[PDB]
Symmetry: D2
Subunit: 263 residues, 4 copies
Amino acid sequence: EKFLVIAGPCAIESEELLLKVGEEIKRLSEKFKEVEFVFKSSFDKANRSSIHSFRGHGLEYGVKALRKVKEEFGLKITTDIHESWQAEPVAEVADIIQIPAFLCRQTDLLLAAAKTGRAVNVKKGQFLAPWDTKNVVEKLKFGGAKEIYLTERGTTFGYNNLVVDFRSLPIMKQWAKVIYDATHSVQLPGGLGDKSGGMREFIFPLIRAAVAVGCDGVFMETHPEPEKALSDASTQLPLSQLEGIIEAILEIREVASKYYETI
Amino acid sequence: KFLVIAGPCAIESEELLLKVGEEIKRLSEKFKEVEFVFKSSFDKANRSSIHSFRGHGLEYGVKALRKVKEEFGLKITTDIHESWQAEPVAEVADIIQIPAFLCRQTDLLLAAAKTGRAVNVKKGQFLAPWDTKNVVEKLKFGGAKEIYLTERGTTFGYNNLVVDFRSLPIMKQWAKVIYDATHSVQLPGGMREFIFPLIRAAVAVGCDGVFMETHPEPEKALSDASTQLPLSQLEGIIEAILEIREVASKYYETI
Amino acid sequence: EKFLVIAGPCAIESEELLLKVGEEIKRLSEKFKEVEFVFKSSFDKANRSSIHSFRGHGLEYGVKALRKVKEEFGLKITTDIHESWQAEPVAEVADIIQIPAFLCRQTDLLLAAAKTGRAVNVKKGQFLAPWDTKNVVEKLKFGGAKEIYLTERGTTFGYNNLVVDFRSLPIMKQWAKVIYDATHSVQLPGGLGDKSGGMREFIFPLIRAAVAVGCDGVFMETHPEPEKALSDASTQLPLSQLEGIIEAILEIREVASKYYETI
Amino acid sequence: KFLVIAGPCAIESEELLLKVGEEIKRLSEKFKEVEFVFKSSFDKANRSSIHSFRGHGLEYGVKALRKVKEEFGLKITTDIHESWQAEPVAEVADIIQIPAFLCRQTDLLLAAAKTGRAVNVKKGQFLAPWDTKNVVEKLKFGGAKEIYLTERGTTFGYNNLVVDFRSLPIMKQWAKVIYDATHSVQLPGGMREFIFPLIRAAVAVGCDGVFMETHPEPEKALSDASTQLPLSQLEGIIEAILEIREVASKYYETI
Ligand SMILES: O=P(O)(O)OC[C@@H](O)[C@@H](O)[C@H](O)CO
Ligand SMILES: O=P(O)(O)OC[C@@H](O)[C@@H](O)[C@H](O)CO
Ligand SMILES: O=P(O)(O)OC[C@@H](O)[C@@H](O)[C@H](O)CO
Ligand SMILES: O=P(O)(O)OC[C@@H](O)[C@@H](O)[C@H](O)CO
Ligand SMILES: [Zn+2]
Ligand SMILES: [Zn+2]
Ligand SMILES: [Zn+2]
Ligand SMILES: [Zn+2]
């Protein structure tokens, strides 16, 4: 089956940043034809730790910026919603509607996404056990979703730290396609006080583990200059490193694939 | 004075709210040293199953809560799940409750602070005690004056919550602290036998109030059946925590 | 039933330190007659994180020093063993043989302690669930122990941190008398790298919680000048604060006692 | 070369050790790029129940292990539980294994280092990856030269272990790293279905070897029956990890 790579800047800092990343993602999609690329970027960071942190330029601007990316590069789009009313307008551009991790149990939000007819990708809550995603998928199916994804992004492990329990990949695979979030799984929740931390040195090895265990895709936040990002500056992957990372997981996926268990 | 938030988890019917409201009114008259607040949700917006009980809607709920405030003169509190609900709910709710999973949703916190009402934020199971400082700041920024942080357990492995009582003194640095005695022993996706023991610990450690879900027949509750405290046991537990508090308060640490 | 207070300096830095603490503990035992005091001190810290940390002056010296405390003040004694052969010599002075937390599953050590006829106190491993102490007690009973204690000293919670799950007190009470370790439950395992850390500001509130829930005793490491201790300098309680702490828990115990559940 | 430590959990009988030893010898001849090491415990000194199988003693055990080293010429490794056992065990063991619960017992580590043999320390379920630096230092202080750190999971709530693969690159800074594929999925006080998936992750991430308990009929094993890998599946898993390693090694990070 076609491997999915969801990537893009964490936040829509501007329509310019988007076109810049989109240009590179378009180039890679032409090279890695066995991969289905989906451009990602949040029109709003509605759950920052600090009131003083960057949130975004609003739904309107964001959707417009995303529509430009899709229009200019012919790339599929995904973005997250935070309240029910946003599902309708977002669905006009987003091929995949993403549900934030803290909101994976909010029934109305899930239902709002499902009735759009668009694919839905739920970030697994840091508080959720892998077997408890079965009910999340059931809610979506009840709401009309026909294409559902569950994203692994780490689990609460003591304070300000997340651990990735790779047993979750084969467990969740029982009810939906599984995506591994390579960048948020290494972030340190509220690590820097007013903001969260992260250890970029573990992004690559954990992503190798993910494809070796077996998943249907990977999620990676990338930025031309991470150190200047308005969000996830500690975890966003340098855009120049994207191609190499993708080639690597495709290679590991291929060699490991024959051993993937039948779920 | 010491705060006691109690009531049925979900508004199964105004009828149910009135029965519980009667007992809470009685206790209110018996324990003048305690500020009672009646609680009940008009919607369980985060049930694990799509087939579980959610409620009768915001209007029916706000109505029933009004019946309790009018008939018994008890303060009110209920939780909201999306920004638009803040204004209508503030009509009856003295304290607006923020669900644990939503403790980081900026607009919900702002929408709550804007109503002018008091705001009680349930500490997310994923949150560290010191990370609540930023939650308080959001509310202050939004105009909130009466701010509460409620301890309801922290994720400890899968389908389990542990109460790190170190959180009480830490959170007290920036807000009043409430201990949720019923949800802290729940097993995500609980054991009633631990409710009382842990509530005794909370007051021995030191908090500004306790939160307890109570139902005439928990066994029949349409929500949190395994954790709701039987109505008839409420009085005894309150008397117990007041006595322990009276003695322990002498040692509560400053700031 | 008579409440137990196990206290003393973490390590036997010298026979002088022992007599100094013993003197104060003796004074308190005369005041708090409803309390059974047991003087504690390790002849060896056999599990320090660093090879460069203080261990002790040997079994011989330690036993001799402890015997002096018992002889001079008429106080019961307790100390921990690390290998089976130590149970016999230690039992000649120790009224209670303590089993280190990391060794709570070592069958021969438990058996060695039990056959001495002395009481045995097992520190619950940071890796052990409360219901799993049932088998630890079974091993001791099998080995002949007639007086058994289980000590709560925290559970692994993420890295370098311990949390106290007070649900453990009533659970363990089903099979043995329960002791709450007020000082080790707040230590930060390997927190300072070469050594562990600790937050003394939480010692008192957590001990209040312990007696409110209900236990059969408390364990507290105390030192004349904690900042100079050769071990647990971050967690050892100043000797001058001991009396006040004890009075406080006795008061909270009394008022909470009528509500203690029948196990 | 890549290390593969395998064998039956407990020395149920020299007979059993010989059957497993035969298959491991065969694989040894088939995979010359791999250094095989035969493992088995002469005593399960930390069983949860007093009524569980421990073993036939140190002498019977050391004898059987000698039979394997002599009859098949395979290197040997077994674990010790008290200092006095180091010397006698070193007579046959090429690698002395330190139990996870005992990874902080200084005298056991020193007693092991003193034998001159290689030492493999199982990382305690209570230990952080960076805390193993001090463990290595103790061994070096004791004269140890060949030092291994084995990842076997970390306490994650009650009766559960999680493998934080970030530990591999961290521990590699000061020692060779081995991934324990069978105990990492055990449920303290496990699921065989996760053994292979996680072992694939270990090699994709990068380690110096893997540890696997194998038994002709795990179902009948007197120890770790729920986690021991069936002997017949060993070859396939080894071939699989060699292939994944071959491809992934290109990306293993330096130091
Ligand atoms: O830096 P802070 O403000 O904590 O924000 C968290 C972000 O990392 C964000 O992308 C997170 O994954 C959202 O919940
Ligand atoms: O998982 P279920 O049983 O739906 O539980 C819902 C409860 O956790 C809920 O009532 C609680 O008050 C909110 O999280
Ligand atoms: O300071 P380190 O060396 O880590 O030693 C740990 C001590 O706190 C010790 O008393 C511990 O409780 C023993 O295991
Ligand atoms: O709890 P039981 O079943 O005795 O388990 C023992 C195993 O954990 C043991 O063989 C393992 O290798 C050591 O800890
Ligand atoms: Zn992001
Ligand atoms: Zn409830
Ligand atoms: Zn100590
Ligand atoms: Zn084993």
